[PDB]
Amino acid sequence: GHMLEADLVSKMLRAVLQSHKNGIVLPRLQGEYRSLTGDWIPFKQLGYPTLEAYLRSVPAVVRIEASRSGEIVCYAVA
């Protein structure tokens, strides 16, 4: 047994964020995420329009701060 796709990407996303308490900007997120999962973020594949929208859609496990600059920094929550 192993994680199902949506659970795999969620737990591994979460785990990178839990190590990286400084947060990771959305393109840096893609990088460090793919270092752990060996896959790119399934945003469009699951049907979210953007990397940000995928990260908006996990508020029970992950957290985000969209900066005034238009970047978004990603964080863990569980």
- Parse the chain into domains and list their residue ranges: 1-78
Method: NMR
CA separation for the pair 1, 59 (Å, rounded) = 26
CATH among 3.40.50.150, 3.40.50.1970, 3.30.460.10, 3.30.420.610 for 1-78: 3.30.420.610
Radius of gyration of the chain (CA): 12
Give Cβ neighbours of residue 6 (< 8 Å, ≥ 6 apart): 42, 46
Long-range contacts of 32-37 (CB under 8 A, 24+ apart): 36/12, 37/8, 37/9, 37/12, 37/13
CA separation for the pair 2, 70 (Å, rounded) = 36
